[PDB]
Amino acid sequence: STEVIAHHWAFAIFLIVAIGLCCLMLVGGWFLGGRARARSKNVPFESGIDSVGSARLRLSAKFYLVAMFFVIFDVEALYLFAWSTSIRESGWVGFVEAAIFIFVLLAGLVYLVRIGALDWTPARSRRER
Amino acid sequence: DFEIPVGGGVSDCYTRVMLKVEELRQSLRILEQCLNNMPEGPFKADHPLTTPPPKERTLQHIETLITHFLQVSWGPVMPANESFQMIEATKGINSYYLTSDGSTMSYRTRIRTPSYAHLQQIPAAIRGSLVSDLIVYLGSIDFVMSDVDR
Amino acid sequence: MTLKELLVGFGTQVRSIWMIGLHAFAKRETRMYPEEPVYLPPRYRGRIVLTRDPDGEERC
Amino acid sequence: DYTLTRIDPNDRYPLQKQEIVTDPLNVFMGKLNDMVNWGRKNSIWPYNFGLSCCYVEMVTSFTAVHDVARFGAEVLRASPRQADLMVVAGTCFTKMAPVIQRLYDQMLEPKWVISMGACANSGGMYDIYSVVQGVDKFIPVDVYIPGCPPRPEAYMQALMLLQESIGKERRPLSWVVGDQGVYRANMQSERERKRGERIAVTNLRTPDEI
Amino acid sequence: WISPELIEILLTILKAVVILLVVVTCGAFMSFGERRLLGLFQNRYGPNRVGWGGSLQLVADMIKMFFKEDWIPKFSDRVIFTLAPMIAFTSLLLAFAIVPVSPGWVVADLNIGILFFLMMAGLAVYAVLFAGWSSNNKYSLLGAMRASAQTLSYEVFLGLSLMGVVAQAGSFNMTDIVNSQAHVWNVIPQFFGFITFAIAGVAVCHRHPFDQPEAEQELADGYHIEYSGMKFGLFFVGEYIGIVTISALMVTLFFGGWQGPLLPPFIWFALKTAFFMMMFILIRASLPRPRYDQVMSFGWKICLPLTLINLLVTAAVILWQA
Amino acid sequence: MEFAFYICGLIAILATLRVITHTNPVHALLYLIISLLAISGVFFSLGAYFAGALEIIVYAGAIMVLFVFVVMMLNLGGSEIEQERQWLKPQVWIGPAILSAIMLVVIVYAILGVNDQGIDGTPISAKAVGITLFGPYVLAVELASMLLLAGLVVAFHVGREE
Ligand SMILES: CCCCCCCCCCCCCCCCCCCC
Numbered sequence A: 001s002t003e004v005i006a007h008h009w010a011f012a013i014f015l016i017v018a019i020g021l022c023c024l025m026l027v028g029g030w031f032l033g034g035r036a037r038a039r040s041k042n043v044p045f046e047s048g049i050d051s052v053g054s055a056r057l058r059l060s061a062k063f064y065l066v067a068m069f070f071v072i073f074d075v076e077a078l079y080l081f082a083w084s085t086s087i088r089e090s091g092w093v094g095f096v097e098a099a100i101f102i103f104v105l106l107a108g109l110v111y112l113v114r115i116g117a118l119d120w121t122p123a124r125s126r127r128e129r
Numbered sequence B: 001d002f003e004i005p006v007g008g009g010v011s012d013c014y015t016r017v018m019l020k021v022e023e024l025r026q027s028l029r030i031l032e033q034c035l036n037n038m039p040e041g042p043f044k045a046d047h048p049l050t051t052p053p054p055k056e057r058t059l060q061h062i063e064t065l066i067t068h069f070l071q072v073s074w075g076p077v078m079p080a081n082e083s084f085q086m087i088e089a090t091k092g093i094n095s096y097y098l099t100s101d102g103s104t105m106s107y108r109t110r111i112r113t114p115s116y117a118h119l120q121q122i123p124a125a126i127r128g129s130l131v132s133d134l135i136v137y138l139g140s141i142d143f144v145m146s147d148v149d150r
Numbered sequence C: 001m002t003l004k005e006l007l008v009g010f011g012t013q014v015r016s017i018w019m020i021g022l023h024a025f026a027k028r029e030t031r032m033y034p035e036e037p038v039y040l041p042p043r044y045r046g047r048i049v050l051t052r053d054p055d056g057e058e059r060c
Numbered sequence D: 001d002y003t004l005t006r007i008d009p010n011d012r013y014p015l016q017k018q019e020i021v022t023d024p025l026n027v028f029m030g031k032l033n034d035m036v037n038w039g040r041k042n043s044i045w046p047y048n049f050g051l052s053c054c055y056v057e058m059v060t061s062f063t064a065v066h067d068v069a070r071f072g073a074e075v076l077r078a079s080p081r082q083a084d085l086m087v088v089a090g091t092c093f094t095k096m097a098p099v100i101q102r103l104y105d106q107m108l109e110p111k112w113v114i115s116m117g118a119c120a121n122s123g124g125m126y127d128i129y130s131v132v133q134g135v136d137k138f139i140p141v142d143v144y145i146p147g148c149p150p151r152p153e154a155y156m157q158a159l160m161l162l163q164e165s166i167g168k169e170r171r172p173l174s175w176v177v178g179d180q181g182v183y184r185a186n187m188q189s190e191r192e193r194k195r196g197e198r199i200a201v202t203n204l205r206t207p208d209e210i
Numbered sequence E: 001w002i003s004p005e006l007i008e009i010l011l012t013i014l015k016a017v018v019i020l021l022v023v024v025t026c027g028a029f030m031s032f033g034e035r036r037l038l039g040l041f042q043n044r045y046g047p048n049r050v051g052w053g054g055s056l057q058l059v060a061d062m063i064k065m066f067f068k069e070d071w072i073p074k075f076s077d078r079v080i081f082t083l084a085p086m087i088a089f090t091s092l093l094l095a096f097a098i099v100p101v102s103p104g105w106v107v108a109d110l111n112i113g114i115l116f117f118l119m120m121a122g123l124a125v126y127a128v129l130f131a132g133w134s135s136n137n138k139y140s141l142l143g144a145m146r147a148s149a150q151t152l153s154y155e156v157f158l159g160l161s162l163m164g165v166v167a168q169a170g171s172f173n174m175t176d177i178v179n180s181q182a183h184v185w186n187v188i189p190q191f192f193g194f195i196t197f198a199i200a201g202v203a204v205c206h207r208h209p210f211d212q213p214e215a216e217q218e219l220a221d222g223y224h225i226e227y228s229g230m231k232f233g234l235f236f237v238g239e240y241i242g243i244v245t246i247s248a249l250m251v252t253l254f255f256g257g258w259q260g261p262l263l264p265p266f267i268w269f270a271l272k273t274a275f276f277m278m279m280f281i282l283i284r285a286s287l288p289r290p291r292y293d294q295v296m297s298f299g300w301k302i303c304l305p306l307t308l309i310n311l312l313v314t315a316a317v318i319l320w321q322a
Numbered sequence F: 001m002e003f004a005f006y007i008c009g010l011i012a013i014l015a016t017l018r019v020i021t022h023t024n025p026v027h028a029l030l031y032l033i034i035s036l037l038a039i040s041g042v043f044f045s046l047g048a049y050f051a052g053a054l055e056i057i058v059y060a061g062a063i064m065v066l067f068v069f070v071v072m073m074l075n076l077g078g079s080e081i082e083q084e085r086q087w088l089k090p091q092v093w094i095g096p097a098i099l100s101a102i103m104l105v106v107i108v109y110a111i112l113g114v115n116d117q118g119i120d121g122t123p124i125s126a127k128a129v130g131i132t133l134f135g136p137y138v139l140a141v142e143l144a145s146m147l148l149l150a151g152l153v154v155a156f157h158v159g160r161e162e
């Protein structure tokens, strides 16, 4: 109808003026103000002294397992997103099935917590002693 | 009269912080005792080597003027001896070790500071920890680099 | 973690929020330099001057 | 009654040339430059750099009992790129002069330098082998503060002096059009200005009073 | 162009542009208000010298940021470095673009709503990730990794905290959510959802205590330390519209949005949004920063099962009264 | 809406083509996010609002952890880029290019032979998907939760440091 077309045009103009304001702001920031000519300008900031190597080294991380579990639990979350918008029309059978769903989720999370997963802290401190 | 805070046997950051809080409270107690009971006497010793001499006697006596004149120009002449004084500083134990060659300067001045020892201890107590633990440990040592390097 | 620890911690955070709000309801402790002059004790060690005798000549 | 500095890396620090020039100040460009200078002097972002005692007094000035935030100078960025003011508050040690030079080079113009304390002004009480006698041996300093340590309102007064210096200086509006040299006003010294009010002081309060 | 449909479309476009200009100006004014309110919370005044009450301090900051040298490092990837402030400025703005501020005053009356908010948060994470990686700095690298861990922690349960309100309204539309609270505000039935959404929404904008990427004390301002000029100002303004967006979103899904007993509806919306903005400044000032490993442990072990249990209880209550 | 579908399809095609033939992993991930946003635009054009919503919600979480693994493993400056550059040679990609081309031709010819009436673009809300998902399609949900549990267990077991 008319109101849907009006809201679509309003959303399009909202996005267009948002990107235009951001790009104009960047252009005004880039074009106004003088530049610099210094010896140590193009050095990454490491608190006043030079780097040992570079900033692009192979950094380790302990967040890998939590990242995969985050993706899995977000997929379970999207299932619950699909469930939650139609709870009333699903009836009690859908409530029982979603209860089984959330119980499997809880059992998986307790399994993750107890086996040592979701625990990547260094063994030195661990907030102990 | 003032109590001494002693921890339970381990040096956490929290333990050090609340020991310093209790030290602040003890210092408040000492200040209260000093304020309520204050003597009425001299603010300088009557020793001839007291530097500087009292100001009014400098201004209207000639022996005191001579003593002040020779004590601010060349300096007081301490005899050739060796002295040491160790005190409890705000950050630990601070000690002065002074060797005099009999001149008006110190032949040797040695200043022991606690932050030097704490900073040397730092690798043995933060190894294996996180950077956040290192930041909290740095915040809970009570060190200044003027004390460390002198 | 222990549920008692979680409840105690949550109470601690809302308590701290309450103290900071009560600080916001309190009196400002500023000294508006340079609108109001900074009070100094008479024996304060600031700028160095050379003075004069009561008779008008310089005392150095 | 101005001065011009032009910078170029390609021997001895500071790598700049300074001369004594005349103010060129345009029915709209002058007011535009005045507006830019007003905006620059009414918002200063000091660098969170500290060396010694004088930094402790600077952050004492930063607190709620003096409130330098009223001048728009509480932002205190820890990165040289985001900062707009280097306050050398402490001793310029020999081993840190390369570090201070690097941190000044990583900073971006519009940049200003405030020496705080006798160590930063001249080396101060430490006429020693391991201290550079004054931080102005290698970086240009805009505002100087005597003291050891300077009291917090002295740092605030130096901030206002820097604001007056910014408010009467000429800088390029854009880096593509116009001259890129920096014009700084040769203002009258505060010693000469305050000689009128300083010699006339007759009686002070005796030290035995509180 | 003389037709009632075309003038209605033009009026809707004008309302959307007015809303966008007001929220951007309010984000900058609330940066200034954060300075003043931190002064008030910390027993001072803050900037009260540039004009009356410091009201021209924002203009001076804007002038300095525009006339600051916009610096692109040679060791950085230029396209990603320029792209990250664009995402940071725009993603939370589009998240705000669904918030109904008044009856008849909304940009897009989407059928997704809070789904679009989740989409914009998942797109807003890439601004911080790209700023950390692109700038080619070690502190920025550590800040980006910490931001990724914090994003894991909050986005594992943000939508599930919102699903209680979604289930109570029975729809994804924003106006249906703000119309379902015509009797009782949603903060009282959804209270555990409320506190979990508070935690997750503070973690959206990376505000205190969840300022793990840009931690001033820990990593010396973090990921945007190579960022300068108006790009850093874009990061600031983007986070401030993020705060405005999260505050207005709590107003819509927990306090009836514009619904109020006596005052005009936009006035009630403005008061509740300003109260939550004050609560953001208070939550910055009040409590300290935890370690991000304990932050992720709290977001996983505590918040996620609590959201799941709250969703189950809300579903049981809804089906009980049907 | 027709133009939106066509331009999003073109953007998705170009972004995917840039993904499969790039040497920078982070740039390839950025073009991948662009392609998935274009796929979401295609989903939103056809009335499948929930499909585009979940394409932006959970795939942006998926590409997020891909980015974490890329910064954890691959980035070494240009050393990754030259190593990937020596791997890609002209004969190497013109080998399977004709295979993919003839596969696309066969699939397109099979597609063009079907009867069509045009997609009317009637929107499908998330309420209908919730009705069907927890109605006729229940054990799909339950055994898919078991599938995600299995994937989580395998990820734990293989991804461990020690
Ligand atoms: C502090 C308040 C922040 C609000 C952010 C969003 C504001 C968007 C612009 C709204 C403009 C229109 C206001 C309502 C107009 C119709 C009602 C008028 C009488 C109250």
Ligand SMILES: CCCCCCCCCCCCCCCCCCCC
Residues within 6 Å of the ligand: F095, F096, F098, F099
């Ligand atoms: C060192 C090992 C490298 C293995 C590379 C394998 C590349 C395989 C490329 C196959 C290309 C086939 C092209 C079509 C051939 C004709 C149709 C199929 C056979 C009838």
Ligand code: SF4
Residues within 6 Å of the ligand: D052, D053, D054, D089, D090, D091, D116, D117, D118, D119, D120, D124, D125, D147, D148, D149, D150
């Ligand atoms: S001038 Fe005095 S207070 Fe300042 S750094 Fe030097 S010794 Fe310390």
